[PDB]
Amino acid sequence: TFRKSFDCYDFYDRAKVGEKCTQDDWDLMKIPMKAMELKQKYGLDFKGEFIPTDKDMMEKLFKAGFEMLLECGIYCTDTHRIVKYTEDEIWDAINNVQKEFVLGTGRDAVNVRKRSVGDKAKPIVQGGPTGSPISEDVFMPVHMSYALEKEVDTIVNGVMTSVRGKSPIPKSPYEVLAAKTETRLIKNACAMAGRPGMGVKGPETSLSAQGNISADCTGGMTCTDSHEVSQLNELKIDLDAISVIAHYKGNSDIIMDEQMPIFGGYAGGIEETTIVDVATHINAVLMSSASWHLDGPVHIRWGSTNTRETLMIAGWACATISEFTDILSGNQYYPCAGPCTEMCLLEASAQSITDTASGREILSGVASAKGVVTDKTTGMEARMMGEVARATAGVEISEVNVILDKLVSLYEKNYASAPAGKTFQECYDVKTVTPTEEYMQVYDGARKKLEDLGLVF
Amino acid sequence: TFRKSFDCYDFYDRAKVGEKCTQDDWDLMKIPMKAMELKQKYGLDFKGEFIPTDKDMMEKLFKAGFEMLLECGIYCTDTHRIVKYTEDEIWDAINNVQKEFVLGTGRDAVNVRKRSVGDKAKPIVQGGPTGSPISEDVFMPVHMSYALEKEVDTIVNGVMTSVRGKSPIPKSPYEVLAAKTETRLIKNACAMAGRPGMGVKGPETSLSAQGNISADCTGGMTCTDSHEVSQLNELKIDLDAISVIAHYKGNSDIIMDEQMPIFGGYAGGIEETTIVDVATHINAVLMSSASWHLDGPVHIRWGSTNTRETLMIAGWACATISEFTDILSGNQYYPCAGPCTEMCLLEASAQSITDTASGREILSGVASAKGVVTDKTTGMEARMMGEVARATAGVEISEVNVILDKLVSLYEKNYASAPAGKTFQECYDVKTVTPTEEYMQVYDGARKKLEDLGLVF
Amino acid sequence: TFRKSFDCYDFYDRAKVGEKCTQDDWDLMKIPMKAMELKQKYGLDFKGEFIPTDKDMMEKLFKAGFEMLLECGIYCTDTHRIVKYTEDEIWDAINNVQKEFVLGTGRDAVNVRKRSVGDKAKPIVQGGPTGSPISEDVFMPVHMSYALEKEVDTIVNGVMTSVRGKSPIPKSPYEVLAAKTETRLIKNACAMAGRPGMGVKGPETSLSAQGNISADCTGGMTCTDSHEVSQLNELKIDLDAISVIAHYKGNSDIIMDEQMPIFGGYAGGIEETTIVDVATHINAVLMSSASWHLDGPVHIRWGSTNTRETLMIAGWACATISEFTDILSGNQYYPCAGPCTEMCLLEASAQSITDTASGREILSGVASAKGVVTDKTTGMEARMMGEVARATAGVEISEVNVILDKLVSLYEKNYASAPAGKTFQECYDVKTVTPTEEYMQVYDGARKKLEDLGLVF
Amino acid sequence: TFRKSFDCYDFYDRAKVGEKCTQDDWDLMKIPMKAMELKQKYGLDFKGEFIPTDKDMMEKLFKAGFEMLLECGIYCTDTHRIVKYTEDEIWDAINNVQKEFVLGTGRDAVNVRKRSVGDKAKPIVQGGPTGSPISEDVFMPVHMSYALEKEVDTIVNGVMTSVRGKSPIPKSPYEVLAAKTETRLIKNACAMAGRPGMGVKGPETSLSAQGNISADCTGGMTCTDSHEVSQLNELKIDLDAISVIAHYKGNSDIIMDEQMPIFGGYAGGIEETTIVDVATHINAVLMSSASWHLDGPVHIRWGSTNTRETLMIAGWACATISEFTDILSGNQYYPCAGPCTEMCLLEASAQSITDTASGREILSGVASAKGVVTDKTTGMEARMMGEVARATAGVEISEVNVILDKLVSLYEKNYASAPAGKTFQECYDVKTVTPTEEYMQVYDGARKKLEDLGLVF
């Protein structure tokens, strides 16, 4: 049996005396070799499906992911050593995951409960800039565009490009100011939308351990908000994250562990990356003591989470995780196209269909324009994300797989030419925080195409 | 119809003017006669089963327990008088019991919902010294050994052998100090384990009404913790408990009413004691306004809750209570053997299987070494309790009954020679609060035997 | 030096192994002998003054009181043993008393700071039934009559003659219900008067340790209210009070220790009883860890706190305590006459003049009709108490002594024939909670006489 | 006029573009040159006095300190650049300092108000291990020894040598665990002493920015506790401290800025080091937005704050600061001798006399055995610190200077042979947390000598 339930403290201990190893040995040999080995050993073959129906294949994927974590362990970048778990420690973690939890407070609180593949229940809609850079002068208005949408349940924070006119440089006092201010302003935006108690997810503007740790404050982040911590690529972590985890646990905060496996990355192709994905979903509740895990498979070239391959990876990972564990999870949205474009909505829609049908409990989006273009994220994308989630809930998986194949085909040949889209200021009337007729027309066009594919809103 | 819903105030009123009766008349005549009468009247026969499958027999047991409470009433030790209920008052109580509730706060809170016989859902695991005496210098470490176990959901408080180096003598200022301090230290131990919001169950060190009433305090016990009040043996109560109940109700506290029916006690044998057990489960929501009821059938000779007879009593009582009422309940663990011994784990395991399969919502243990030996309780026993609960959930009752018969046979011939076991300090490394390899080996041995019996972890 | 700062825990310890002694030996020998001895040793002679101006005499009184406590110790009724203090323990207590504190919350909070003899600052006016029995159906209205008076700063709770139509019998569940309910209703009455945050003083309806300990609750008593504990007569205490003290300390509650030395009691006459009074003021911060001490010298025959002798006792005790210590204190009001009578107002007025000029920080009244007649207490008496306090603040002590001699002469010959007065229902319009013209006329008459004596309102 | 009131954000800005300078240029040239220049320019000469009476000389010292800060600026170790202030920015800071504040909560809260030289009011007594290493198994007991002393008003945290049996290594998860746990345990110790609301000062176990920032938590440090941030030597700071300051401000926390000028250090001798001291008192409210400033002049060789020179430095600095500003301040205690030795008590006593008479608002001690020996700090030293403070309050300065000269002479020839003293476990009975008769005897001996010097307790 295990000595004690594994936690961030055990990780630190082991990271200091674990097997020495270069990062190249890990990225260019250990990880890719194991992913390759397990894929063949278990004969994993997704056969073009976005969401699996073959439970035998799913079980093999689960065993593969479990074995990957067990045999490889986790690489600690700071100490350049490997942390290994025992089989009993992993099971103790999987066997005792958080069953459910509440986000937000008052009338605005929402319950997060497990969803199974093809579940009739709608997933939680977490809308916001999704970590994208937002100008300080429109920080509240932008977030308000999500709070005003009834489709949105909780908010995923954007990043303040500046606070008091200064860049929140990591480890500078401005980073601390931004960490606290971020959620304070966002919750104020929610209050202005008549929903003061909406839960949020962050802190996003802060990057350092000290910055993230300063986010919990009066008027800001509290225990009813999702607290983020990020795993690295692949099956890797830094000590800063380990300390942040200790802080979250010490404040009784809901913890959201994230990991964005890279398709075509160190793991390799589809099945290989999915094995890693299952392994990191598991590692989330083991290493990070996560309340829930946020996925986000991204294409090495396109940098999007909604390519055919990344959707398949997320679908299989979640369906498998939902089938064999009680781990709560979500997925993040990174479309290629920007706001106010049909492609952006269709890209997000494809992922919403995939996530909803595969069993995700939370949809966190949308980081339009790949989430790296200032002010290019609006509540309209989250609205589509939510409406599509509703339309998808309860639909037969065989039908969903057909719809996805057709939908993805409508844009997968235009990644290199994805329309840049517009900023919040360009497709919304900033003063009243309402979309322009232009955006409303684009929205209708995208909706019509989804309906022609078979979706019923 | 009833005049008003019955409460502790009505009880006090009636206890002052009820039928005069000596305690011997109650213990040596009224109770045993009624238990005997109802057993034969309803032809109760458990036929060697730990968990019932015969619903007709179960219904007769329920009616017997109800009739026992209705015809006998409750004996008040202070006034030496009998309190009688009407049929309508009893039904009003049974028809309006607490459906569910939350224990603990923040990320660490857990939901307590009803479980049915053979339920696939796992019961809540309440781990702790279970009222056993713990040295003041290791009070936090000992409780931390439970908080560190992911298997544990909530804590059941131990007893401080001293506070500030003095015995918490009943009705002395030290009793008050211990009542407040107890939970303050325990919650601090939980915080050190990264779970600041774990709910607890107590107050245990205090015994007097004033002592128990002083336990609610800042940093200590709050409304999200289970508040204990104990019924006497059998169908009996003291006025001190009546006042404590009034206090719990006045603070909107979750109330846990306990009663440990004695096999071979004033009631008689198995079926007789079970009739009493059903009667006291009912009395819990009637007299104590309980949120949930804690059982604990104990063998008159062995003083354990896991003997063949006591397991059968608990199994039938809970299965019956779960089948015909919505009363939430739990059971407490008193093994003969001490910590770090195979017998202790097997004893607790047998009860965990019984409690889980019979429908208990909460498992509260483990009071190793019969809970009367200083420092002889550790989180390892609670870990086994939880793992066994998981393995038992969902298993066919017919199969469970076979496993129990075989398991109990492995130790029921060694009660008189149960190994004393070791203290926390002896089988754990106090500084890091981790079990020794010795304990881990014993644990594995016990686990293997359970697996050979058919349990799947 | 002392081993540790003395507290209720040390008291308990010592009370179990102290010198055995009968209560008669204490009341009929030890106390009266020491009071007699110290009076002569120090040549104490108050020479008819209500408030002292002779500092040498005052210093001798202080030394006498200190020596009395040091040489006699405190008698514990439960163990029938004597608890002794060392000189260093007493000084440690006197040298570290609470300097000041806040009562109540929000806009309604008030600061309690030290007052010196003849201080220009007005004392805090604590108005209420002052522990007198009040009918349940007018509990809120009666207290509201005090909250509505701007003269009143805080409330001193009355006693509920019944709760839910039942007597709050000590150690019955009704006592607990009344302890919590009492302040909940009173604070609600304060809220109805537009002063939701007024601080209170209690719990009064409860008498047992368990009853008093249950009073702290949501909506009821909190740390910003004065928590009562009573010393016995003379230099005596029961263990129940010791446990209550431990509870108050454990909840960070403001503690009010009370003691009502009896003129003509076990101590003897004026100077003797004053020596005891000084000794119990000191014992308050030593044994009870009091935030402030409530005095209340009472005439053995008349049972009033405003007789010539009791006023002299309070005046000298407070003036002396104020001169040589920083101990915060107050005095309680027990007039012979009932509400709506000129005598009652004049009796209370005489004490208000004495208390204010002698340096009391808090005036707690008025327990009209000797506080034992149901519903015979109204805010009108507290109004006079406050107005007189204002008029007295800043007045030359020599002048105050002249006014007191004249005022007391106006009623000291009518104790045996003091008018019974009327109930709240008789001299107030219950629905609007306003005094009748009859009472207003009586008030004016009393006020005029005070003005003729030299008081300037 | 100034552009904006100066804060930690402006400091960061300026630290990145300020004049480049090596740390040697700062320590070996700029600082010593300016201190030397200003000492001669203003003709500063303390003439052997511990506490100044010559106001002209005091005013010159103030101007010197102000000019030092203005002309030199502050050296930022991370950027190796100098931050300069304008005269208007410095005055804006000095003209708007925090007037007063409350530490702790409930009955246990205390008011911190300004004290002038020779003030009759007693300073606040902050007792605790004063940052010294304390074994984890006695962390609560040790702090309880201070909470139990009525002389102590607030607690100054000790350092946990381990948490869960591991060293709280900077930037490791254990540092975060210790930062939160530290105060949680200490406040629990205070509660056990019957003073749940005592304010504390820390976080001490944490050293990194992330560690310190994680200390604010439920059950732990809150806005009513003093939050520490340390200036370096001399007129120097690191960016980590700048970020911590931003966090404290963002949580509305009471801020305590500390600086320990070194006698014989980079500044030079007595007057030189005092000029630096005055400059850092000012910098505290400018750079750190401090609520109050903690001083601590230390002898370069002896490492003690109570040598003749360090006492003179503190006395002149505080007297001057108290005379010309409203800056609240305190001083920390570092005696050479260890606990349970006469020298230790006399050393602390000398500083208490100096601090009290010179106008300090808070006394924070005692770090016995130079605060670097595990478990060698007990409440007994704080008791002496407090009693001496009481005895010193109100005494004529000329008399105080005579007493100090005589007292310091009693030990200033034994620094090299200062007795090591004993640990808490050796001079206290750990179980009851009470000093041994041995310590009590030593205490009496030290007290007698102080009395022979003229101190009146």
> Which CATH number does the domain housing residue B151 bear?
3.20.20.460
Residues 6 or more apart whose CB falls under 8 angstroms from that of D7 comprise: D249, D289
Terminal alpha carbon distance of chain D: 51
Considering only CB atoms, B165 lies closest to which of D162, D191, D432, namely D432
Question: Residue D177 contacts by C-beta under 8 Å, 6 or more apart in sequence?
Answer: A9, A246, A250, B192, B194, D163, D164, D168
Contacts with C189 (C-beta within 8 Å, 6 or more apart), sequence order: C139, C140, C141, C143, C144, C147
d(CA A103, CA A156) in angstroms, rounded, equals 12
**Residue D304 is part of which domain span?**
1-457
Touching partners of D (3+ C-beta pairs < 8 Å): A, B, C
CA distances from A122 to A366, A443, A448, B212, B280 (A): 17, 21, 21, 46, 43
Q: How far is CA D122 from CA B302, C452, D315, D360, D395, in A?
A: 64, 45, 16, 9, 11
d(CA D154, CA D414): 32
Method of elucidation = X-ray
Separation CA C112–CA C88 (nearest Å): 28
- Angle (nearest 5°) at CA C51 between C48 and C53: 95
Which helix (H) or strand (E) segment holds residue C373: the answer is none
Tracing tokens 């989470």 back to the chain, one arrives at: A305
Strand C292-295 with C110-113, pairing: unpaired
Task: Label residue A118 exposed, middle or buried (CB < 10 Å: 0-12, 13-18, 19+).
Answer: buried
What's the rounded Cα separation, in Å, for the pair B276 and A96?
A: 36
Nearest to D12 among A172, A213, A242 (CB): A172
Closest CA to A179 of D201, D17, D174, D249: D249
Peptide linkage before D366 cis (omega within 30 of 0): yes
Of D337, D270, D230, D245, which Cα lies nearest the Cα of D61? D270
Q: How far is the C-alpha of B59 from the C-alpha of B322, rounded, in Å?
A: 11
Please state, in angstroms and rounded to a whole number, the distance separating the CA atoms of residues A259 and A236. Answer: 10
How many residues does this entry show for chain D?
457
By the 8 A CB rule, do C347 and C335 touch? yes
Cα dist. B404→A355, B273, B319, C185 in Å? 44, 20, 16, 56
Distance (Å, rounded) from C-alpha A44 to C-alpha A54? 11
- Please choose, from the candidates D244, B248, A179, D129, the residue with its C-alpha nearest in 3D space to the C-alpha of residue C177: B248
CB atoms within 10 A of CB A412: 15
- Are B58 and B365 in contact by the 8 Å Cβ rule? The answer is no
Chains B and C in direct contact, meaning 3 or more beta-carbon pairs closer than 8 angstroms: yes
Residue environment code for D164-194, b if the CB has 16+ CB neighbours within 10 A, otherwise e: bebebeebbbbbbbbbbbbbbbbbbbbbbbb
Distances (CA, A) of C311 to C51, C328, C349, D46, D434: 9, 18, 11, 56, 43
Q: CB-based burial of residue A24 (10 Å sphere; 0-12 exposed, 13-18 middle, 19+ buried)?
A: exposed
Helix (H, G, I), strand (E, B) or coil at D67: helix
C162 vs B: CB within 8 A: no
Q: Which residue has the tokens 């075989």?
A: B406
Please state the length of chain B.
Answer: 457
- Which among B126, B408, B433 has a CA at the least distance from the CA of B294? B126
Chain C residues with CB inside 8 Å of D195's CB? 249, 252
Are B96 and B5 in contact by the 8 Å Cβ rule? The answer is yes
For residue D100, the surrounding DSSP H or E stretch is strand D100-103
- Cβ C172–B12 below 8 Å, yes or no? yes
Name C435's bridge partners.
C428
Give the CA distances from residue B217 to residues B178, B250, C175, D188, in Å, rounded to whole numbers and listed in that order. 12, 14, 20, 12
Is D126 in contact with D330 (CB distance < 8 Å)? yes
Long-range contacts of D90-96 (CB under 8 A, 24+ apart): D90/D66, D90/D282, D90/D286, D92/D2, D92/D5, D92/D6, D93/D5, D93/D6, D93/D282, D93/D285, D93/D286, D94/D282, D94/D285, D94/D286, D94/D325, D94/D327, D96/D5
* Residue A335 · residue A348 · CB < 8 Å: yes
Spatial separation of the C-alpha atoms in residues C336 and D291, rounded to whole Å: 54
H/E stretch holding A431 reads: none
Q: Measured at the alpha carbon of residue D264, what is the angle toward residues D263 and D269, in degrees to the nearest 5?
A: 80
In whole angstroms, give the CA distance from residue A306 to residue A414: 13
- Segment 326-355 of chain A within 8 Å of chain D by CB: none
Q: Mark out the alpha helices in A18-147 (DSSP H runs).
A: 23-25, 31-41, 55-72, 87-94, 139-147
β pairing state of B236-237 and C434-435:
unpaired
Distance CA D81, CA C259 (A): 67
**Residues in CB range of D361: below 8 A, 6 or more apart:** D112, D113, D114, D115, D123, D124, D292, D328, D329, D330
**C208 in reach of chain B (CB within 8 A):** yes
Instruction: Answer for the pair C169, B239: CB distance below 8 angstroms, yes or no.
Output: no
DSSP A221: B
* Subunit partners of chain C (3 or more CB pairs within 8 A): B, D
- Helix extents (H) in A154-238: 173-192, 209-213
**Cis status, amide bond into B151, omega within 30 of 0:** no
Query: Can you tell me the distance from the alpha carbon of D125 to that of B94, in angstroms, rounded to the nearest whole number?
Result: 59
Scan residues 95-114 of C and list those with Cβ closer than 8 Å to B.
none
CB neighbourhood size of A282 (10 A): 26
Query: Do the chains A and C touch each other, judged by at least 3 C-beta pairs below 8 angstroms?
Result: no
**How far is residue D66's CA from residue D44's CA, in Å, rounded to a whole number?**
14
C-alpha D199/C-alpha D192 separation (Å) is 14
Give the torsion sign (CA, B441, B445, B451, B452).
Answer: positive
D311 CA to centre of own chain: 13
C-alpha span between A248 and A246 (Å, rounded): 6
Residues C6/D449, Cβ–Cβ less than 8 Å? no
In Å, how far are B132, B423, D89 from B372, measured between CA atoms? 6, 12, 69
Q: Going by DSSP bridges, is the β-strand pair C74-76/C81-83 parallel, antiparallel, or unpaired?
A: antiparallel
Domain count, chain B: 1
CB contact under 8 A, D151 and C92: yes
Three-state DSSP at D76 gives strand
Is residue A117 within 8 Å of A51, Cβ to Cβ? yes
Cα separation, A421 vs A178, in Å, equals: 28
| Residue type, position C334, single letter | Y
Beta strands C154-156; C200-202: pairing state: parallel
> Are the C-beta atoms of A396 and A118 separated by less than 8 Å?
yes
* Token pair 């100096």 in the structure block, residue: D354
Chain breaks in chain A (C to N over 2.5 A) after: none
DSSP-derived secondary structure letter, A305: S
Q: Please give the backbone phi and psi of residue B212, each rounded to the nearest 5 degrees, phi first.
A: -60, -40
Residues D217, D218, D223, D225: what is their CA dihedral angle, to the nearest 10 degrees?
-90
Residues of D in contact with B219 (CB under 8 A): 187-188, 191, 196, 219
Rounded Cα–Cα distance for residues B251 and C258 (Å):
28
Residue A196 structure tokens: 């003061």
Is the CB of residue A250 less than 8 Å from the CB of residue D177? yes
**Residue C457 identity (one-letter amino acid):** F
Tokens 């420092």 — which residue? B375
Distance CA B437, CA B428 (A): 9
* Chain D residues closer than 8 Å to B162 by CB: 431
- D194 to chain A, any CB pair closer than 8 A? The answer is no
Tokens of A388: 């599509």
* Interatomic CA distance for residues A112 and A226, integer angstroms: 11
The sign of the dihedral angle between the CA atoms of A113, A119, A122, A126 is positive
Of D105, D387, D444, the CB nearest to C252: D105
State whether residue D166 sits within 8 Å of chain A by CB: yes
Could you give the C-alpha distances from A19 to A283, A288, D188, in angstroms and in order? 19, 21, 41
Distance (Å, rounded) from C-alpha B253 to C-alpha B236?
A: 23
Q: Which two tokens stand for residue A130?
A: 């999704």
